[PDB]
């Protein structure tokens, strides 16, 4: 095998990644009054970054090493700050909003990328953008927004979760801009970029977690429920593996296959999180996910750079 017929690697890796994230973040830790929700987000991102960095280092060591990097360290730091900010904000968003909403919000990169490109790069997309984005807008309005906001979440001031989601989207857009500019101007390979940004994010996260007095403190939580020690680790590992497998898709059959695989994986994750953990999705809502995914696929198919 090894062909796109069954790319079990990425599929299983990201499936386990999503299921583990939903289990750990929204896990019903404790019983009754003695309940402690998962309020720790920096530690998880720090562990994930460390595992990704070590796997990237091993991958580069075991693969071609003739390439010599030409990028500057401060550029890596500038990318990493936004990268870690986006990851941490998105992860923290799960403490208020439901998981399907979080994944739907994190699956809306086209809007921010188009906005940043128009504002600064001034790139014009007569048909690819400004015309197919209406589908994304309609879908997101269907799911996250009510008919007139009068039934459901109500028109009251949204919780901090949606604002955190917006912050994550903005940071993701900025990170994408920085990565694209650096790649265009310095010709940096994927492995070196991932390793450097992960190392910088690891250092910053370590300093922050030590200042916040969490690592020195939160270990009592793990002690009370030692199981979380194992599960979280597994989660991180999965992410790393995905990246490695993603590299294959980059070199084999181009990136369109990887994009479509990511889209279908996101849809499958929505289905699983709505069918396994029983997070009811109101009527006239699934159509919104359908609209958003259809728009994303059409963009990835028609009018794709």
């Amino acid at each position, epitope marked *: 095998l090894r062909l796109p017929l069954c790319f079990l690697g990425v599929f299983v890796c990201y499936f386990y990644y999503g299921i583990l994230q939903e289990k750990i973040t929204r896990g019903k830790y404790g019983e009754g009054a003695k309940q402690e929700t998962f309020t720790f987000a920096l530690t998880l991102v720090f562990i994930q970054c460390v595992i990704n960095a070590v796997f990237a280092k091993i991958l580069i060591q075991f693969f071609d090493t003739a390439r010599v990097d030409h990028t500057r360290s401060w550029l890596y730091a500038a990318c990493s700050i936004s990268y870690l900010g986006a990851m941490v904000s998105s992860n923290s968003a799960l403490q208020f909003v439901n998981y399907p909403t979080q994944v739907l919000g994190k699956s809306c990169k086209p809007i921010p990328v188009m906005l940043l490109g128009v504002t600064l790069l001034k790139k014009k997309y007569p048909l690819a953008k400004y015309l197919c984005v209406l589908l994304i807008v309609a879908g997101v309005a269907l799911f996250m927004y009510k008919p007139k906001k009068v039934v459901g979440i109500e028109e009251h001031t949204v919780g901090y979760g949606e604002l955190l989601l917006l912050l994550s989207l903005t940071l993701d857009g900025l990170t994408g801009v920085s990565q694209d500019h650096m790649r265009a*101007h310095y010709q940096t390979g994927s492995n070196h970029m991932m390793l450097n940004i992960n190392l910088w994010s690891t250092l910053l996260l370590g300093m922050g977690i030590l200042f916040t007095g969490e690592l020195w403190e939160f270990l009592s939580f793990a002690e009370r429920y030692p199981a979380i020690i194992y599960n979280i680790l597994l989660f991180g590992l999965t992410s790393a593996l995905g990246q490695s497998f993603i590299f294959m898709t980059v070199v084999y059959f181009g990136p369109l296959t990887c994009s479509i695989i990511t889209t279908t994986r996101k849809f499958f994750t929505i289905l699983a999180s709505v069918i396994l953990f029983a997070n009811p999705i109101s009527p006239m809502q699934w159509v919104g996910t359908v609209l958003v995914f259809l728009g994303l696929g059409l963009d990835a198919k028609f009018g794709k750079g």
Partner: single-chain antibody
Amino acid sequence: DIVMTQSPASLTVSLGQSVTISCRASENVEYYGTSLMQWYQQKPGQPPKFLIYGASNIESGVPARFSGSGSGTDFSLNIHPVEEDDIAMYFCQQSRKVPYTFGSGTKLEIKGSSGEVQLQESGPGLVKPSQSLSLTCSVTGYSITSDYYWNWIRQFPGNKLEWMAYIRYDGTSDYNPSLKNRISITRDTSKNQFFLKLNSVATEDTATYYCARAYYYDGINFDYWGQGTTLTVSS
């Protein structure tokens, strides 16, 4: 490796004519939408002067007349108002892969005919084949421990350039795969020098050697050049 080709060997022009020089590559030289093409100018008996990077960006200080265009595997350098100043040989270079190469060059002639870093070369003049050789390049007004690449290049008779090797201030060094088994590059930050050592030279190394300084942006660019030292090998 890529074999750059320059079609017009030589040209004749008056003062007030548009001059366009073509350059071709055997493989695509664009990476993520950016073209890695450099254009240099060399007057007789002088080191080449860095002119254009990216095939479209004019280096600071170059007069506005010069311009570049093209993409894919075809590029062209254009000067509309040629003057007396710009009469020299123009070279096109690619930086898509490690063995950077220069074209055969095109010659243009008019019908009818402390703050700056200083680099100085030194070494032997005459040497018999089958004997190891060493050359030194000394840098003043600057420290070789800052962010800059330091390269050794050589030019054969007939003006066919061939990049030899380079070393980065971090200590990382790169060699030409053809010469990787013969030449070695070393440095010394105490006396602010760097040396190139060749093993079992032959008669084919008769050429002029330059040591240059370069910085990477849309491909390596050799901003500063030394005066160059001759080397004749014979029996």
